[PDB]
Amino acid sequence: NQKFFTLSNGNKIPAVAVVGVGTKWAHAEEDATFSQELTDIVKLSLDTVPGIVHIDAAEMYKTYPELGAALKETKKPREEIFITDKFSSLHKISEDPKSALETALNKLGVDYVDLYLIHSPFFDKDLNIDLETAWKQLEELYKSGKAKNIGVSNFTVEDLKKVLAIAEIKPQVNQIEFSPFLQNQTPGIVEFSQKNDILLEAYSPLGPLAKKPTDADQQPFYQYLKELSEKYNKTEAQVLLLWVYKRGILPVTTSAKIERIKQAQDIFSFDLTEEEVKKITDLGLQHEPVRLWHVDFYTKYNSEAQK
């Protein structure tokens, strides 16, 4: 049965996000073009995936049209969809969060998003707004009900503290890259976030499987994962996704295939033991970090990432 995290404002959020619209089939020599393949898999997810379906979208993904189409054509009630959207701070598309969300709501055909994030602390030079002002804009979007929850993405402890210094509403979420091969995107972020009651989301939790070293079959991380997979009769991805949940973090995943999306939603059909969670953690920490996002900014933190 579906699990939820409870945010610091009392609101519930589905404890896995199974549908993303950031990734599409993409040609090498690619086109800001419409992915019919993407709108199809989203629609199919909304129609067939049981429970509240948590979707991860972003201004910078430029896929509001695809998601909008799916949202229109599905018969899934609005209340059984949890939509996360993100203001594109790294790459300027709108002037500010309020103008971005208006555009997004209009393209999406919805009245509100369930969670609104600042996508990055590395504000584009062309923005005429800084982090503090952008946060105060999220606070007002929250006030207006256009975002039911608000938070940030890819923030360091230092970035968080800048928000907390001026915040009337504490960020409910910090969406970071997290996996067994990147257990601290930036130094101490996991411990700091969880100590201050900011729910972590984990982007690319399946990083170990996305980027699988050539000698993986002699690697104990991968050997243990296969063992747990066989024990529970679950996919390796499911085991990793559940692990993230057992670390108290919300795994945010996406797939090209509806079977994989349903499997992601169904991770709460089994349970890892404390012993198993700790072994995944420990075998993970022994591995060299794998970082797939914010690579140019945060490569410099690779040395603290498994620390």
Side-chain angles (χ1 to χ4, degrees):
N1 211 185
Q2 179 160 39
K3 293 322 211 332
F4 302 83
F5 291 105
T6 304
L7 301 174
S8 61
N9 58 7
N11 293 350
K12 305 285 198 238
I13 183 170
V16 63
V18 297
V19 170
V21 291
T23 295
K24 45 184 201 162
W25 291 84
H27 201 291
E29 302 101 82
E30 198 165 12
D31 297 305
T33 174
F34 194 87
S35 187
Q36 192 54 51
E37 315 85 276
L38 180 54
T39 184
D40 282 350
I41 192 69
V42 170
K43 194 196 172 304
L44 186 53
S45 296
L46 290 166
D47 285 316
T48 62
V49 169
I52 302 173
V53 171
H54 178 178
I55 302 175
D56 192 83
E59 182 177 31
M60 187 176 46
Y61 297 162
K62 300 181 182 276
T63 51
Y64 291 142
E66 283 98 322
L67 173 51
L71 286 179
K72 181 170 167 193
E73 288 171 48
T74 192
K75 314 204 145 172
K76 188 66 144 174
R78 176 66 187 93
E79 57 265 43
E80 291 173 17
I81 310 171
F82 190 109
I83 299 169
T84 294
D85 174 37
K86 308 187 186 68
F87 165 70
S88 182
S89 48
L90 176 65
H91 179 63
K92 183 194 185 167
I93 296 158
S94 310
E95 278 297 314
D96 58 8
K98 59 189 202 184
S99 59
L101 185 47
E102 267 327 296
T103 304
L105 297 177
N106 279 324
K107 294 178 168 161
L108 284 181
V110 293
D111 304 315
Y112 67 96
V113 298
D114 294 276
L115 171 67
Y116 199 49
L117 309 181
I118 302 174
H119 204 159
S120 169
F122 288 95
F123 276 38
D124 195 324
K125 51 166 164 46
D126 293 313
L127 284 173
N128 300 133
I129 193 182
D130 61 14
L131 169 55
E132 289 83 357
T133 305
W135 183 254
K136 287 186 194 212
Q137 286 206 3
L138 268 67
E139 282 181 337
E140 274 295 340
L141 288 176
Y142 183 71
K143 197 169 177 166
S144 72
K146 286 178 176 177
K148 192 174 179 196
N149 303 283
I150 52 168
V152 295
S153 186
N154 301 302
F155 273 40
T156 67
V157 171
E158 292 63 39
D159 307 316
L160 282 187
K161 280 171 176 184
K162 284 184 50 155
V163 168
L164 292 173
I166 52 71
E168 177 164 44
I169 302 306
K170 193 171 68 174
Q172 287 115 44
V173 169
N174 182 20
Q175 181 179 104
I176 61 168
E177 183 175 13
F178 178 92
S179 88
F181 295 177
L182 200 84
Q183 291 193 46
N184 262 310
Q185 177 187 48
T186 71
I189 190 55
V190 165
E191 297 66 38
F192 180 78
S193 296
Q194 292 193 323
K195 172 208 209 180
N196 286 268
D197 188 24
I198 304 167
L199 177 66
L200 296 160
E201 289 188 316
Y203 209 87
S204 274
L206 298 189
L209 300 175
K211 183 199 176 171
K212 188 165 189 170
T214 48
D215 61 327
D217 290 349
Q218 280 74 50
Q219 291 279 8
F221 180 76
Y222 291 100
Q223 290 165 336
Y224 183 57
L225 191 46
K226 194 162 176 189
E227 173 189 342
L228 289 189
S229 163
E230 298 187 13
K231 172 173 172 194
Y232 286 104
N233 192 19
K234 300 290 158 178
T235 72
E236 292 179 11
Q238 284 179 297
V239 171
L240 290 189
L241 292 170
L242 185 49
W243 171 81
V244 170
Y245 174 74
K246 299 295 284 197
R247 296 293 306 291
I249 300 170
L250 199 174
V252 172
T253 190
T254 198
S255 308
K257 271 184 307 194
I258 193 62
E259 288 88 354
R260 276 177 186 166
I261 295 164
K262 296 180 197 216
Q263 281 164 345
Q265 185 84 338
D266 198 42
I267 58 164
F268 301 114
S269 66
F270 70 122
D271 196 16
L272 299 174
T273 70
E274 303 207 306
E275 177 176 359
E276 284 159 354
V277 173
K278 194 202 163 167
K279 270 171 71 177
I280 299 164
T281 293
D282 291 356
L283 291 172
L285 284 183
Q286 280 179 336
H287 210 277
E288 223 153 75
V290 170
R291 188 189 297 280
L292 295 175
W293 302 95
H294 266 234
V295 175
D296 286 351
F297 300 104
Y298 288 162
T299 282
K300 62 172 176 140
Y301 295 131
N302 281 4
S303 72
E304 309 321 296
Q306 299 286 77
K307 201 155 176 304

